[PDB]
Amino acid sequence: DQPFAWQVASLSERYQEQFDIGAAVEPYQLEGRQAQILKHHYNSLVAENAMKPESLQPREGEWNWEGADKIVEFARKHNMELRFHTLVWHSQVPEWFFIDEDGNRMVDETDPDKREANKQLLLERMENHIKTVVERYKDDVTSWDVVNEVIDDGGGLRESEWYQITGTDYIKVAFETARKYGGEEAKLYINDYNTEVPSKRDDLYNLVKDLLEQGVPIDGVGHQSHIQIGWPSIEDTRASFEKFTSLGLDNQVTELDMSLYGWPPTGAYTSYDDIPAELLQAQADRYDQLFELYEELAADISSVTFWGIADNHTWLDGRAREYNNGVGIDAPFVFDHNYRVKPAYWRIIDLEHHHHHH
Ligand SMILES: O[C@@H]1[C@@H](O)[C@H](O[C@@H]2CO[C@@H](O)[C@H](O)[C@H]2O)OC[C@H]1O
Ligand SMILES: O[C@@H]1[C@@H](O)[C@H](O[C@@H]2CO[C@@H](O)[C@H](O)[C@H]2O)OC[C@H]1O
Ligand SMILES: [Ca+2]
Ligand SMILES: [Ca+2]
Ligand SMILES: [Ca+2]
Ligand SMILES: [Ca+2]
Ligand SMILES: [Ca+2]
């Protein structure tokens, strides 16, 4: 029987000279064992949902600050670094942003002059959303996910409502506005998943390089790192981090979780007791290799955040259920559903000096 997470050496202390160790949280998790584990193992937080655009401003001028405020207060009280997730996204974004003042959907507008006005209105709404949020939290946030998931998996820019209405201008204006109100001190990140996939890595690199060349203030790349036991390779992860470091950008691992399954997560286990020990062992072997790579690149990585605390709360449960007729669980962390350490904990808390790789 494994010890509980509050009985073992701190992850954040183990990596304190190398990078932050963070967790995504909900306000209701800021009590009990989850809070105890947070304060022991992590020195950085991010809001899993409470700071997304639809959570904060679900209707225009309706500001829903309570959940986000509780996360900020917890970070203040326990002296934790705080990432802000996220200022601009095509999901969990309220639809009122994209409706003109006559009630019509901007994406449907055919008149060229009205499309140009819609672009100005949407950009101004985004500017005011950013200004309001940054002005409230600027003294508590260290790293900002300014834009999230703007690159398409099929190549090129994601053709969300943001892109259809403004082109790339929403990206430039979002960073410019975050810098304007957060100051030069604020660290501004573009965040995405599958940044290890070479075609997507290259699209992101080319977008960021072009923006940097226009003076857009981008400080780093957020690698969501929603990964698997068999994918992506350490080699492709290394190549991605190094490509963005070559532009002078910081790298953060922002939403790390390692699913037991492939994509999509078909054939999921429906009970934690059904998970074979050798799968958790394969997961431990992979986390070992992953965190050794992070150690090798520690000069280029400021922070590594897991998208959750322990296996009893992870969006990967919902993904399993979406692809297995409503049932299924996933177990992606180093702490299991009972808060007991997993094989993976032991394989990332130890200290190795000779890092092997391909
Ligand atoms: O909506 C996004 C998902 O589509 C994304 O899912 C990824 C799709 O590409 C696959 O290769 C990945 O395995 C899978 O995780 O996750 C992020 C979410 O915001
Ligand atoms: O509770 C769920 C969240 O955990 C989930 O968080 C998103 C996962 O995909 C990533 O690509 C996003 O950046 C991240 O915000 O969003 C859905 C929600 O139901
Ligand atoms: Ca830091
Ligand atoms: Ca090792
Ligand atoms: Ca570092
Ligand atoms: Ca789970
Ligand atoms: Ca190790």
Residue numbers in the entry: 2 to 359
Kindly provide excerpts from the paper associated with this entry.
To explore the role of this extended loop on the substrate binding and catalytic activity, we made crystallographic analysis of WT complexed with xylobiose. The space group of the crystal was P21, and the structure was refined at 1.80 Å resolution. The whole structure of WT complexed with xylobiose exhibited no difference compared to ligand-free WT13 with rmsd of 0.21 Å for 353 Cα atoms in chain A. Figure 7A shows the active-site structure of WT complexed with xylobiose, and Fig. 7B shows the comparison of WT and T315Q. In the region (residue 311–331) with the largest deviation between T315Q and WT, three residues (D312, D318, and D331) are involved in the Ca2+ binding, and two residues are involved in the binding to xylobiose. R320 interacts with O5 of subsite + 1 xylose and O3 of subsite + 217, and is located near the acidic and basic catalytic residues (E150 and E256, respectively) with 8.0 and 8.8 Å, respectively. These evidences suggest that the mutation of T315 to Q deviates the position of R320, affecting the dissociation of E150, leading to increase in alkaliphily of T315Q.
